[model samples]
Target: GIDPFTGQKLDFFKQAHEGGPAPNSEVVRPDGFQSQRILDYAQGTRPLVLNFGSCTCPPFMARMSAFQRLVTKYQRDVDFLIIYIEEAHPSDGWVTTDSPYVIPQHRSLEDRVSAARVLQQGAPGCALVLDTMANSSSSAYGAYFERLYVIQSGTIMYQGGRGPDGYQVSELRTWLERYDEQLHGTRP
Candidate 1:
């Protein structure tokens, strides 16, 4: 697929799918930019709603309100996290002038952290993490573009389709709604 902004050919890759083990990789927590692994949350019993995105992706940014609302609704029953990944439309790479998110591709951890912080403004309530300069978490999950996943006990329970066209938060909400009901004996 071609990036809508810069007309660059996108290198889409396979991601961890449903019923598969969630990939574990080191990521930047951004709280002083500390290092942490995905396993830290995967090891727990709580269902983790993982979102991989960047501010540069208009599709990703467009869904922030819906995503944040789900996070707020399930804040007490689930763990919601935003994994800040590679720029899908960085100014220096796949550039876009239509959006206000103008920035270059991350060349350092600080750069990634800065970008993640920008995305955090829209999702103040959810926990945010940054993918390493090496994009460990991004590559491990094949999340070059925005995506979503629901993980529990280290296994992927729901895998969202890729963003722009396939990204569907409503589908994710369906799984979350059912899971919430099953786990708590009440529908959300």
Candidate 2:
């Protein structure tokens, strides 16, 4: 398909989160990071709502509050997470936001972690994890910009569209509520 940002053809999203078997991968936090969460998550059955996002994205910023409400509502039944990827519109990008502080393109491990940390400040309260400098998580998950995915028992349950405009919080919420109803016999 065509990438909106560069108007280039990108096949990275061909099968990404396309209701296939979810990929088991490791994620990093700021300090004392471990892969225990990763290991334990894949071994058993648990619904995971993984969000690839940052505060700098204007659309992301606008929908964060609603996303937060979802977290607060479903945190008990879903393991919500914010996997911070590289800044979509960083200083190095041609269409940088009208802000001098729109973080620079990450080039180091620490830089990625720091970027994640900064993103958490304005986040909607979720387990925050950072993408590596190699962007192993982002690349595997097709999160070049931002997206939402739900994985359970090493399988993809639902995948939201690409972000900025395709990122529909309502769509995710609807599926989540349905998943919850399936789990518990009641609509949220």
Candidate 3:
């Protein structure tokens, strides 16, 4: 029977991976980043703040900005990461023609590189990373489009709902402050 409190079936968490211990597969480390590997980013050892976002999601822009501020404030203590998932407004998926000026085009690698360079030149502190392949990492974690997660010791300490209506940073900020206090014995 499942343990209602912890929501684990006991048999599930104990399942082996391939021929070894259940893989610590939740952690994700983006390419081009020199930070520690994903498996090393467990809870209690180092709190991880993850944002799952898409390029065209307007709410993501605001949420990311808020997260950036939080990161700046607590970067020394917390590991902040962003995973760019599948495009919400990609030409190939869910194309809306309501306003051509409002909707930005999904560019090729070269175009993305140039655009990133230009954008970063102006906003140097933006923390951005991309998952061009639209891999299962985001989906497995229940992060589609825009979402937030606070992971500790390889388990989800806090998980926000899905995008748009589910996107919230104030609540996350409050939780983070509380969690930080519990971890550090003082406000950071």
Candidate 4:
């Protein structure tokens, strides 16, 4: 995949997919509150869902609420986290008029933190973590614009296709339903 911000084609950047080991990477919680690793959630008892997106991505903005609903429905059986990464459509980059906010590409950790805060408002209760200036988590997961992942016991149980064409929360919801039924004998 070609990096929209850098324009360098990542020929060897293999995207994570189902049946693969999730790339365990560090991400900072909101407000620079704390730094934590993703596998902490992955190793937990409950299955985990990792959503990678940015406030600047229009596809993510549109599906934000639907993603939240999945959180509401599956909070008991699944842990969900949003990894806020590089801006897909910055004002100085691939600009899009569909977005409500006019944000530029983040230059520092603080800049990404500020942008994630605005996105936090849209997701009232979900946990959000920031990708580093180097875009560690995003690059590891190949979550450029937006992507969805389902992890259980440190393994990628389900990996949704990339966005804006491949970002589908409904599909994640379906995976959760099957997972829930398999684990608990009933769907949530």
Q: What TM-score would you give candidate 4 relative to the actual structure?
A: 0.84
RMSD per model, one decimal? 6.8, 5.9, 8.4, 4.9
**Candidate 3 residue-wise lDDT, 1-188, digit = tens:** 98888897755444222223212444222334333333454445677777766555657665655677888877766777666555555544455633221324445434333333433453355554543443444545556667777776666666775445633787678777887687678853
Q: Can you tell me which runs of candidate 4 are displaced by over 4 Å?
A: 1-15, 94-98, 163-167, 186-188
lDDT of 4 by residue, 41-140 (tens): 6546788999888887777788888889888888878899899998887878643555677778899888888899898877887888898777778888
Q: Can you write out model 1's per-residue Cα lDDT over 1-188, one digit (the tens) per residue? A: 78999799985655578898888888988878788988776536889988888988877888889989998788677888889998888887643456578878888888988898887776766788888888898778777778888888888888787544534788888888887788788753
Clashing pairs in 3: 43-152, 43-153, 43-154
The total number of steric clashes, by the backbone 3 Å criterion, in model 1 comes to 0
Q: Which stretches of candidate 3 lie over 4 Å from their true place?
A: 1-37, 40-44, 92-94, 97-128, 132-134, 163-167, 183-188
| Steric clash pairs (candidate 2) | none
User: 1-188, model 2: which lDDT tens digit per residue?
Assistant: 88899899976534555668776565776676544233244325768887886656666666767878888888777877777777877877787478435788878767777777766776635677776666767777777677788888777888777545734788898888887788788853
**All models: lDDT?**
0.81, 0.71, 0.56, 0.81
Worst 10 residues of 2 by lDDT: 34-43
Which candidate should be chosen as best, given lDDT against the real structure? 1
Task: Give the Å shift of residue 33 in candidate 2.
Answer: 4.9
Model 3 TM-score relative to the real fold: 0.63
TM-score of 2: 0.79
How many clashes (backbone N, Cα, C below 3 Å) per candidate?
Answer: 0, 0, 3, 0
Q: Which residue pairs come into collision in candidate 1?
A: none
